[PDB]
Amino acid sequence: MNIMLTLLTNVTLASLLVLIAFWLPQLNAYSEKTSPYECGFDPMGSARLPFSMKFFLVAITFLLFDLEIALLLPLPWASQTNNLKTMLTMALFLLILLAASLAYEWTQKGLEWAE
Amino acid sequence: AGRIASFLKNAWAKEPVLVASFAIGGLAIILPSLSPYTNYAIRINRATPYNYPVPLRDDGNMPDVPSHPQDPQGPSLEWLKNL
Amino acid sequence: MTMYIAFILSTIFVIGFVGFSSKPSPIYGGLGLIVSGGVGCGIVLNFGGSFLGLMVFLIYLGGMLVVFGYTTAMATEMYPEVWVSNKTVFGAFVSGLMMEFCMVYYALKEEEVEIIFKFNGLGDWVIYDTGDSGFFSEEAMGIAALYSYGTWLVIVTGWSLLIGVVVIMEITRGN
Amino acid sequence: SRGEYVVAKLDDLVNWARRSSLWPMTFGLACCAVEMMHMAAPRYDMDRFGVVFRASPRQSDVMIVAGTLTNKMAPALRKVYDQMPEPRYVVSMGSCANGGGYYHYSYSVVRGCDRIVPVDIYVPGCPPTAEALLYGILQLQRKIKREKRLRIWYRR
Amino acid sequence: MFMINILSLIIPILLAVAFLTLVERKVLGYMQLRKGPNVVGPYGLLQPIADALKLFTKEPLRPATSSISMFIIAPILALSLALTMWVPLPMPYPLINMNLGVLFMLAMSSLAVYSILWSGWASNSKYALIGALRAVAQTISYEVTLAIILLSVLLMNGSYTLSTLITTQEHIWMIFTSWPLAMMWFISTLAETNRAPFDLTEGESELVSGFNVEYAAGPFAMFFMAEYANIIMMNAFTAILFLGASHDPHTPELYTINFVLKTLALTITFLWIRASYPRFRYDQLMHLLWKSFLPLTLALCMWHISLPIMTASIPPQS
Amino acid sequence: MWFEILPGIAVMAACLFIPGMATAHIHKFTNGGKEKRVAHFSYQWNLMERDRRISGVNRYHVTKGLENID
Amino acid sequence: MPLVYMNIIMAFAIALAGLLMYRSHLMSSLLCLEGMMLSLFIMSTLIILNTHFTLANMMPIILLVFAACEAALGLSLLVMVSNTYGTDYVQNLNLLQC
Amino acid sequence: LFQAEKDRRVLQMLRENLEEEAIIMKDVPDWKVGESVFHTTRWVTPMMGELYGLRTNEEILSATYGFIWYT
Amino acid sequence: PFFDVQKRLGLDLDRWMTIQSAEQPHKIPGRCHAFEKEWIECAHGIGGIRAEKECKIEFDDFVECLLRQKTMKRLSAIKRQRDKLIKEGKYTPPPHHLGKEDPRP
Ligand SMILES: COC1=C(OC)C(=O)C(C/C=C(\C)CC/C=C(\C)CC/C=C(/C)CC/C=C(/C)CC/C=C(/C)CC/C=C(\C)CC/C=C(\C)CC/C=C(/C)CC/C=C(/C)CCC=C(C)C)=C(C)C1=O
Ligand SMILES: CCCCCCCCCCCCCCCCC[C@@H](O)O[C@H](CO[C@H](O)CCCCCCCCCCCCCCC)COP(=O)(O)OCC[N+](C)(C)C
Ligand SMILES: CCCCCCCCCCCCCCCCC[C@@H](O)O[C@H](CO[C@H](O)CCCCCCCCCCCCCCC)COP(=O)(O)OCC[N+](C)(C)C
Ligand SMILES: CCCCCCCCCCCCCCCCC[C@@H](O)O[C@H](CO[C@H](O)CCCCCCCCCCCCCCC)COP(=O)(O)OCC[N+](C)(C)C
Ligand SMILES: CCCCCCCCCCCCCCCCC[C@@H](O)O[C@H](CO[C@H](O)CCCCCCCCCCCCCCC)COP(=O)(O)OCC[N+](C)(C)C
Ligand SMILES: CCCCCCCC/C=C\CCCCCCCC(=O)O[C@H](COC(=O)CCCCCCC/C=C/CCCCCCCC)COP(=O)(O)OCCN
Ligand SMILES: CCCCCCCC/C=C\CCCCCCCC(=O)O[C@H](COC(=O)CCCCCCC/C=C/CCCCCCCC)COP(=O)(O)OCCN
Ligand code: SF4
């Protein structure tokens, strides 16, 4: 109840601020003022052209790594089991595999951006 | 055991971050086995009463089962108070 | 009858699924998937699944960000489409919305069976168990039992992640 | 009356708000831009007046034409002037921007920036000292103070 | 009565952001051997009010090529999330007492990045697109390290509740136990808020204001308040996490004063760092985090998993 | 000054003072002035519900001592 | 069955149809795949929480993990496809016939 | 004590519900009041739809969402 | 097909999770522990073919505990008749249902 009330209040305040910003001052917009912004001249192409990604492999590796934290986050509760040896071994095994994957990607020049 | 000294010196001169991380990881891997306090942690974990201790029906042949919480029988956490 | 909070959330979930399922210029598909993920996190929050919802929401946000980057890099056109910029996209969106509305009305008015079984209605609060819990959280204990009970699951999951890293390296190697 | 007092007070508040915070666009051309830099130097510290540079025209209030305006540059200056949201003010600095100055008779120099954009304040010199430009900015502040928009709207 | 609490949490944060900006100008000015704003009011105290009134009485323009809906939505999302992710903070009593405050804070911070991305894409300009791509790269660089650092630090708390961090460090600061993680977390916080030397999303000298280059008057102001609220909030979170204060249940004013002072110290440190260093490059930041921060973090995480079991000091509240 | 930065900081500090204390006060004003109860688990919620049920006025913070059992 | 279960099932069906329609791009189909994963995750966690299956609580998390792999896998292939044609259009994948 | 109290509170609600059902369904031709839906004859915990089924909306809301929504 | 190496080597790789009544952490019970236990004990040993006929009552009870379809039908009928009687004007609900009646610790 309280959390959605907070979210509604924040959204309403932001929307009201936008409304005041857009309806209070005097608006005088013509075709030249609203043109797309380059430094001083007209853009040659378009901003919707494909834009090369030199770190795509790092992006996919981040996609895979973002679930290692998902697996590791329950550790504060996992550290409360009776058999701490098995839990410790499993946690260390998971972290060792994470480190080994990172090392493999490091040595094979996977962290270097494309030229 | 001679070339490893030069390799360690070169690694410490060039990339100390990797050396420190490997040392910390190795310490965290080996030391818990040798620590005598791990069993204390396991016992402390076992001694936490999350759920209700269900009483046992008396059949007249349970000398080690206390008849009351204050009776001398049963597990004791006197070792925990000194820890 | 109790404000239908779970019902409204599930309806918004289905609406977002329709929105991103019409394939409108994946930027907006990503927006729809984010909305659906957040609303589903709220839904499972309402059932007591705090960790799973936050976890699902957190994982999806990270994934979507990578995807936004990938559609900017490789899946963009001169005039990106939107739900009202194409006849086929608008048709799919309206068809999905109408199907959702029709099913909701038919299930609310009558106990109609569509695919699996009949309809119940009367809110989802009824099935909630009245049993109480202790000083722990059942969800937290069940999830944390992964490291003590699920050794096999941890092993196979770690091997899968390592093999996945190797596999993406090999695939995007090139040659 | 009552409405006259209200519009006068509101106009005073708006004028003070616009005057006390002028954000000139980061835009220099020639010699006079060095004196523009020296205005921001610790000795004069234009920032203490609320005057702070901003790069994007959309987030700028004032343009300071500091240097010669050549024919090849005039379209760019006009374009970046048009993209500044209103209200906007132009301050002409130096003889080159005022009326051509040393290169008045050149084939490739616009004889004054007032042919391209409307100018509010003219700062004379070659180059004007940082004190002269600070005086010009303060004069622009006074000119903004004198303006009466809401009072004129009420009497319409 | 709860709406009173909501407003009493919202409005003072906005006022603090407004004056925070004034403080930043003055601190930078003195450091740069000048004065900073001292003319608008007594010691420049009226400068933020003049800035806000100027920005909200100025014409906002929507570019012709821009996608209007996303362009409008992005600043609203930014400001809403900046105000929202303040609630679970215990000072010393949180407004919303949640079982997992840290995970919610992480999720909202991860959602915060999307507003920057949407604004950059909807502006339909090359500089805005480059800024959005830089934001994507920055998030990819810092997110995993930030999460693992948080997990490693919280392993000694016993749970993700933010209120428990007050009693975890009742006797000694946590910074005396995990100071390497403290420095790494500080750098990650610097990179998360898009602050110098990691302010690559804006890039004044490179991308001419970057992603918000097309935001003229009002939405640009909202972006600024969102960024500064994130600054203050994240520094307060760091102060709570690492520099724990004394909480007396009969007088929370002492804890509130101490926490506010520590937050102000961290914010002034942020301004100091901005004034002191040149800017990174958006690939060197990724290399630094993955190459140096990640290996150390993994090692530290292993060490902090092993240490409570090694020394038999596992925290309560499973 | 260098001390002219102190006023603005103070104002900011004052602003950062407002939320915290206010929240505390509100809690007290809404809970009989005794530090609003924290219910993280189901047992604490059950205790709160029992207090509300036996209070007789439908407020959990109205505590009943020994005088309510004769 | 309550309305929530049927709504989740319909969300899965809609995502499956969207994947099977294959409009123009390849990234949209991947988005539909992630949507199907999300719907399955929500259904599974609702079922697990309703019946208080404590040990099954780690079942969804493992699910999520393999989701990433699938997603990662798809993205990898997408990249290579783009590198062959400059566009991820499914129309270009027609070299092999039946 | 809490456990003892809970059993009594649960039993009373069922009795209150059973009596109300016996009053309501007296005119339905083929309805057996208090009829179980299970073939077994042991005790089954109430579904919490059987406890607060005939009560008002705020009671239901406090019963099912009271703990989760309390922050 | 099913190469049962767990039974041969006695490993218990994934059998701890198959059913709902098998050693949950902290002894937290499933919602249908009794019904599942009864059905498992009934069907164990006889075989799959017989268990679908002789242990049908236990499985029906287990399914009813899982989905509560019959209970929801009964409750919906009860509330439908109650609201119809209220609309006609013969029911007059009691104070405890209204909430006027005092709660018990
Ligand atoms: C010789 O060769 C040449 C070059 O080579 C050397 C050149 O280079 C060159 C070009 C160079 C010229 C153009 C000159 C350029 C000058 C120099 C290069 C540098 C000079 C100064 C620099 C830019 C450094 C500036 C850095 C300083 C520290 C200034 C401070 C930095 C700021 C950007 C930070 C502050 C940010 C702003 C002030 C905005 C803050 C305002 C906020 C948005 C408002 C507050 C938010 C509100 C909305 C809050 C509202 C909330 C409310 C509740 C508040 C209450 C309101 C109610 C009414 C109550 C030329 C021409 C040249 O010839
Ligand atoms: C800061 C947080 C707290 C703030 C709390 C207050 C929230 C304020 C709400 C935000 C809006 C404030 C904007 C202030 C100006 C009002 C804008 C608009 O609504 O008014 C006029 C809109 O009016 C329409 O033009 C005509 C309205 C005719 C229809 C009547 C409305 C229905 C009522 C029926 C009539 C019966 C009598 C009306 C009185 C009840 C302006 O038209 P327009 O010129 O484009 O806009 C330019 C405004 N300028 C000139 C100031 C620059
Ligand atoms: C036997 C066949 C050997 C050849 C085949 C090898 C191929 C399979 C890979 C390894 C086999 C995994 C078998 C492990 C099954 C887990 C059960 C057993 O090991 O006991 C566990 C003990 O686990 C131990 O830690 C040993 C497992 C550690 C394995 C090390 C990882 C390396 C495996 C190699 C493949 C991994 C990927 C590649 C790595 C380089 C848990 O017992 P316990 O906790 O008392 O009881 C739990 C139940 N409670 C909670 C009710 C009390
Ligand atoms: C959302 C809640 C807020 C709503 C709006 C209120 C905002 C706060 C108002 C801020 C008040 C300060 C304005 C004036 C500051 C005093 C500075 C004084 O010096 O100004 C003089 C004159 O100031 C103006 O005359 C006063 C303007 C104030 C107008 C009162 C309006 C009150 C606010 C009402 C808002 C809503 C009205 C109700 C209807 C809705 C001229 O000085 P100036 O030459 O420059 O500078 C000298 C430079 N030196 C020092 C180097 C020599
Ligand atoms: C629950 C308590 C919360 C408190 C939170 C902490 C503290 C917050 C307060 C923030 C401090 C703001 C700095 C104020 C410095 C004092 C400036 C003052 O001395 O200068 C005067 C400014 O006076 C202004 O009236 C004071 C404005 C300061 C308050 C605005 C802060 C915005 C929040 C509330 C806005 C409502 C404004 C209502 C008054 C207009 C001079 O202006 P003025 O006397 O005119 O002279 C020009 C007119 N003449 C030419 C005819 C003589
Ligand atoms: C089985 C134990 C595992 C647990 C511990 C480890 C936990 C996690 C830590 C490791 C994370 C991944 C490590 C990745 C290794 C990458 C190596 C590499 O190839 O990088 C080289 C650079 O690194 C090297 O120099 C090669 C390896 C150097 C030594 C690495 C560690 C060796 C052992 C050190 C510690 C020894 C034991 C501790 C003794 C302490 C002293 C008493 C490439 O150089 P670049 O930076 O990419 O480019 C430079 C040109 N522009
Ligand atoms: C007996 C068992 C004990 C176990 C051991 C545990 C302790 C381990 C001891 C070592 C810990 C060291 C931690 C270091 C953290 C990482 C630092 C690092 O290595 O990165 C730096 C880089 O780091 C930076 O430069 C970041 C710059 C950012 C500057 C920001 C401001 C500077 C500092 C301001 C004050 C910091 C305040 C910290 C605490 C704040 C309070 C919370 C190196 O990078 P390169 O020089 O490029 O080398 C690699 C290429 N060959
Ligand atoms: S006016 Fe003089 S100093 Fe200024 S740009 Fe022209 S020639 Fe250079």
Judged by phi (left if over 0) then psi (alpha if -120 to 50, else beta), residue C167 lies in alpha
Separation of alpha carbons C23 and A114, rounded Å = 30
Tell if the CB–CB gap between I104 and H5 is shorter than 8 Å.
yes
- How many Cα atoms are found within 13 Å in the side-chain-facing hemisphere of G26? 23
Best to test chain I binding among G47, G50, G52, G61 (most I CBs inside 10 Å): G52
Separation of alpha carbons D63 and D51, rounded Å = 12
D103 in Cβ contact with D68 (< 8 Å)? yes
Tell if the CB–CB gap between I16 and G53 is shorter than 8 Å.
no
- I30 contacts in chain G (CB < 8 Å): 51-54
Best to test chain I binding among G47, G49, G55 (most I CBs inside 10 Å): G55
Give the number of residues written for chain E. 318
D31 in Cβ contact with D67 (< 8 Å)? yes
Q: Does E235 touch chain F (CB under 8 A)?
A: no
D4 CB-near residues (< 8 Å, 6+ apart): D151, D154
Q: Does E231 touch chain F (CB under 8 A)?
A: no
Q: Token digits for A14?
A: 């932001």
Instruction: Ligand 1: list residues with CB < 6 Å.
Output: D 26-29, 33, 36-37, 40, 47, 52-53; E 14-15, 17-18, 21, 25, 28, 48-49, 51-52, 55, 221, 224-225
Tell if the CB–CB gap between B25 and E303 is shorter than 8 Å.
yes
Of E77, E298, E308, the CB nearest to A98: E298
Nearest to H70 by CA among B78, D130, E111, A3: A3
Question: 3-class DSSP state for residue D87?
Answer: coil
Separation of alpha carbons F26 and F24, rounded Å = 5
- Ordered domains of chain A (ranges, CATH): 1-108 (1.20.58.1610)
Resolution (angstroms) stands at 3.2
Separation of alpha carbons E18 and E12, rounded Å = 10
- E148 contacts in chain A (CB < 8 Å): 69, 72
B55-76 core/surface letters (b: 16 or more CB in 10 A; e: else): eeeeeeeeeeeeeeeeeeeeee
Nearest to E46 by CA among E14, E21, E82: E21
Distance from CA of F39 to the nearest CA of H (A): 8
CA distances from G2 to B25, C114, C126, C127, H34 (A): 50, 13, 9, 9, 24
Q: Give domain status of residue G98, yes or no.
A: no
Check whether D113 is labelled as a binding-site residue: no
Atom from ligand 8 closest to the CA of residue D127: 3
- B50 contacts in chain I (CB < 8 Å): 26
Q: Token digits for A77?
A: 């509760």
Nearest to H60 by CA among I97, G83, G69, E273: I97
Separation of alpha carbons G56 and G47, rounded Å = 10
**What range does the domain containing G24 cover?**
3-92
Question: 3-class DSSP state for residue E279?
Answer: coil
Q: How many CB pairs under 8 A join A and G?
A: 23
Judged by phi (left if over 0) then psi (alpha if -120 to 50, else beta), residue C130 lies in alpha
Nearest to E51 by CA among I19, D54, F33: D54
Return the best residue to mutate from I11, I14, I15 for the ligand 3 pocket (most ligand atoms within 8 A of CB): I11
Tell if the CB–CB gap between G79 and A67 is shorter than 8 Å.
no
Separation of alpha carbons B38 and A82, rounded Å = 11
Q: How many domains does chain G have?
A: 1
Backbone phi, then psi, for D92, in 5-degree steps? -90, 125
CB neighbours of residue C160 within 10 Å = 17
**Residue E180: alpha-carbon gap to chain centroid:** 20
**Residue E113: alpha-carbon gap to chain centroid:** 12
Separation of alpha carbons E286 and E142, rounded Å = 8
CB neighbours of residue D93 within 10 Å = 30
Tell if the CB–CB gap between D47 and E34 is shorter than 8 Å.
yes
Nearest to E193 by CA among E156, E227, E155, E241: E227
- For residue D120, report the distance from its CA to the centre of ligand 2, in Å: 32
Q: Token digits for E130?
A: 């480059």
Tell if the CB–CB gap between G53 and I32 is shorter than 8 Å.
no
CA distances from I96 to C128, F49, I104 (A): 22, 17, 12
Q: Token digits for D110?
A: 């616009």
Nearest to I70 by CA among G44, H23, C118: C118
CA angle in degrees (0–180, nearest 5) for H29-H30-H34: 115
Tell if the CB–CB gap between A37 and D82 is shorter than 8 Å.
no
Separation of alpha carbons E65 and E71, rounded Å = 11
Chains in touch with F (≥3 Cβ pairs < 8 A) = C, E, H, I
β-bridge partners, D66: D28, D93
CA distances from E72 to C32, D85, E61, E224, E294 (A): 17, 17, 11, 15, 37
β-bridge partners, D24: D62
- F56 contacts in chain I (CB < 8 Å): 102
CATH class given for the domain over C5-172? mainly alpha
Separation of alpha carbons F5 and D70, rounded Å = 44
- List the determination method: cryo-EM
Q: Look up tokens 């403080």; give the residue.
A: E23
Domain ranges for chain C, please list them: 5-172
Separation of alpha carbons I56 and I50, rounded Å = 9
Give residues preceding each break in chain I, C–N over 2.5 A.
none
- E139 contacts in chain C (CB < 8 Å): 65
Amino acid at C167: V
- How many Cα atoms are found within 13 Å in the side-chain-facing hemisphere of I27? 7
> In which element (H, E) is residue D133 found?
helix D130-146
Separation of alpha carbons E81 and E109, rounded Å = 8
Q: Which of residues 7-46 of H touch I (CB under 8 A)?
A: 8-9, 12, 16, 20-21, 24-25, 28, 37-40, 42, 44
β-bridge partners, D92: D65, D122
Q: What is the CATH number of the domain that holds D33?
A: 3.40.50.12280
Give residues preceding each break in chain E, C–N over 2.5 A.
none
Q: Token digits for E159?
A: 């749970």
Q: Which class for C88: exposed (0-12), middle (13-18), buried (19 or more C-beta within 10 A)?
A: middle
Backbone phi, then psi, for E244, in 5-degree steps? -75, 140
CA distances from G41 to B30, C47, C52, D115, G1 (A): 38, 14, 9, 67, 18
Separation of alpha carbons C37 and G31, rounded Å = 12
**Residue G88: alpha-carbon gap to chain centroid:** 18
Best to test chain A binding among D25, D63, D86 (most A CBs inside 10 Å): D86
Interhelix angle for G3-21 vs C5-21, to 10°?
A: 0
Separation of alpha carbons A106 and E294, rounded Å = 12
Tell if the CB–CB gap between I105 and F53 is shorter than 8 Å.
yes
Ligand positioned closest to the Cα atom of D29: 1
Tell if the CB–CB gap between C137 and F41 is shorter than 8 Å.
yes
CB neighbours of residue G59 within 10 Å = 20
I22 CB-near residues (< 8 Å, 6+ apart): G55, I15, I16
Amino acid at C6: A
DSSP D109: B
CA of C117: which chain I residue's CA is closest?
A: I69
- Starting at the earlier edge strand, list the strands of the sheet with D62-66: D62-66, D89-93, D121-123
Amino acid at E302: M
Q: Does I16 touch chain G (CB under 8 A)?
A: yes
Q: Does B27 touch chain A (CB under 8 A)?
A: no
F26 in Cβ contact with E4 (< 8 Å)? yes
CA distances from C55 to A74, E107, G61 (A): 10, 8, 8
Distance from CA of H46 to the nearest CA of I (A): 10
DSSP E293: I
CB neighbours of residue A73 within 10 Å = 26
Of A50, A63, A71, the CB nearest to G72: A63
- How many Cα atoms are found within 13 Å in the side-chain-facing hemisphere of B31? 17
Separation of alpha carbons I26 and B51, rounded Å = 7
CA of I29: which chain B residue's CA is closest?
A: B51
Ligand positioned closest to the Cα atom of D12: 4
CA distances from E256 to B11, C147, E247, E278 (A): 47, 39, 9, 35
Amino acid at A104: Y
Return the best residue to mutate from D27, D29, D31 for the ligand 8 pocket (most ligand atoms within 8 A of CB): D31
CB neighbours of residue D100 within 10 Å = 18
CA angle in degrees (0–180, nearest 5) for B45-B48-B52: 140
E308 in Cβ contact with E315 (< 8 Å)? yes
- I91 contacts in chain H (CB < 8 Å): 24
Domain ranges for chain F, please list them: 1-70
Instruction: Ligand 4: list residues with CB < 6 Å.
Output: D 9, 12-13, 16, 19; E 39, 46, 49
Nearest to E40 by CA among H43, H5, D22, I80: D22
Nearest to E8 by CA among G23, I47, F26: F26
Q: Token digits for G5?
A: 């279960």
Tell if the CB–CB gap between A82 and B28 is shorter than 8 Å.
no
**What range does the domain containing D147 cover?**
2-155
Give the number of residues written for chain C. 175
Strands (E), chain D: 62-66, 89-93, 121-123
Return the best residue to mutate from E235, E283, E288 for the ligand 7 pocket (most ligand atoms within 8 A of CB): E288
β-bridge partners, D28: D66
- G52 contacts in chain I (CB < 8 Å): 28-31
Q: How many CB pairs under 8 A join E and F?
A: 98
Atom from ligand 8 closest to the CA of residue D30: 5
Tell if the CB–CB gap between E144 and A66 is shorter than 8 Å.
yes
User: What's the farthest any 2 CA atoms get from each other in chain H?
Assistant: 49
Of G61, G68, G79, the CB nearest to A64: G68
Q: How many domains does chain D have?
A: 1
Nearest to E18 by CA among E37, E45, E54, E43: E45
E314 in Cβ contact with E308 (< 8 Å)? yes
Question: 3-class DSSP state for residue B60?
Answer: coil
Please measure the distance between the N-terminal and C-terminal CA atoms of chain E and give it in whole angstroms.
34
Beta-strand pair D62-66/D121-123: unpaired
Amino acid at C60: Y
Backbone phi, then psi, for E216, in 5-degree steps? -85, -65
Q: Answer positive or negative: Cα dihedral of E226, E230, E232, E233.
A: positive
Q: Answer positive or negative: Cα dihedral of E76, E81, E83, E84.
A: positive
Q: Give domain status of residue G77, yes or no.
A: yes
CA angle in degrees (0–180, nearest 5) for D92-D94-D99: 75
Tell if the CB–CB gap between C131 and H61 is shorter than 8 Å.
no
Separation of alpha carbons F40 and C137, rounded Å = 9
Chains in touch with G (≥3 Cβ pairs < 8 A) = A, C, I
